[PDB]
């Protein structure tokens, strides 16, 4: 009964995950209690057929850093019934990050968290670095935005 969850439709829907990003992509399936479950990652520039179901919810993240990704240019992907045997594509891409977010990504990728506050940068940026992407937070955020 959380607002974001898969429905147990038990109706098969063949999907093709297409990783059109330069990241290693973690597909995240929201189970029937809305809890996120990881599925096998996709290397950059690769596609994979998936057996999923109508009304299941998926999101996608950078597997290493959980940076947000988009799927058909939105946050959540929901398989529909296949028309005439054609699978539904889930085209996974980078969003346009803010420059600030992109710089924080690069800095996080280079600097162990214990060493963030050894950087010679303006002090408000330490907490920005520390507040790394988090799927649970995103789910709470997407849930609020939905209500509104």
């Amino acid at each position: 009964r959380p607002v974001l969850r898969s429905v147990n439709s038990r109706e098969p829907s063949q999907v093709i995950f297409c990783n059109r990003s330069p990241r290693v992509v973690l597909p995240v399936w929201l189970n029937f209690d809305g809890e996120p479950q990881p599925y096998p990652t996709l290397p950059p520039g690769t596609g994979r057929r998936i057996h999923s179901y109508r009304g299941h919810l998926w999101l996608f993240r950078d597997a290493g850093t959980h940076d947000g990704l988009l799927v058909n240019q939105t946050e959540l992907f929901v398989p529909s019934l296949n028309v005439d045997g054609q699978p539904i594509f889930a085209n996974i891409t980078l969003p346009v990050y803010t420059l600030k977010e992109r710089c924080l990504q690069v800095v996080r990728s280079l600097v162990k968290p214990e060493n963030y506050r050894r950087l010679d940068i303006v002090r408000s940026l330490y907490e920005d670095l520390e507040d790394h992407p988090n799927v649970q937070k995103d789910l709470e955020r997407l849930t609020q935005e939905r209500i509104a």
Binding site: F32, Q37, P40, P43, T46, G47, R49, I50, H51, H56
Partner: peptide, 15 residues
């Protein structure tokens, strides 16, 4: 019964 996604044994393909 609850039916979760799964992945068929198959090669990935290049885009």
């Amino acid at each position: 019964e609850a039916l979760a996604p799964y992945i068929p044994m198959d090669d990935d393909f290049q885009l």
